[PDB]
Amino acid sequence: SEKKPIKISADFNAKAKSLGLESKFSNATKTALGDPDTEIRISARISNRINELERLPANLGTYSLDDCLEFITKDDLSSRMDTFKIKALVELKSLKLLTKQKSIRQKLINNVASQAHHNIPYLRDSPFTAAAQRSVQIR
Amino acid sequence: NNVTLKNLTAFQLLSQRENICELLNLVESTERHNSIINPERQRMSLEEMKKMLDALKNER
């Protein structure tokens, strides 16, 4: 507190940490979704939800409490009978198309990362990226 | 042992920050500065120089 708050030593991992740059020497960070245990758990939860959704009845109308103003005469069709059925179908199908969304997302991410050094200014303009792109084109 | 853009930028920024923090006297680097100087190693090297000089002096 009173004295120098840094106290650099000859470790370079405490020295780098004390000045802010700690994770900046590792390739990729540490995350939670990278373990098979959490993956199995998430898959279990998703399968349970899909099971519950599929065990619903097909005839799943909804009484909307605003049908009062629509003077239904036992022959007309209520304009809101399919509102919980539509939501159930939407959730079920969205849960069944998860891998497709994952694939499209990873395609987008890869095709936007591969062009980082060409589309992002502060990466394209550093002397090191420019030097590397020049070094590749040496005839 | 590998050098990527991230490593290079981190190294350069670390050097710059260390230098500036030293300008403001916000860092105490006695351990590094006395492991590089190593006054024990200084005395050892000085005595070795003296012995070698005496050896060269007495061979004549």
Partner: peptide, 16 residues
């Protein structure tokens, strides 16, 4: 907090 205190003390010692 105390970081600003230390930084400003260092700058004042540097400028004086």
């Amino acid at each position: 907090s105390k970081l600003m205190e230390c930084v400003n003390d260092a700058v004042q010692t540097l400028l004086q």
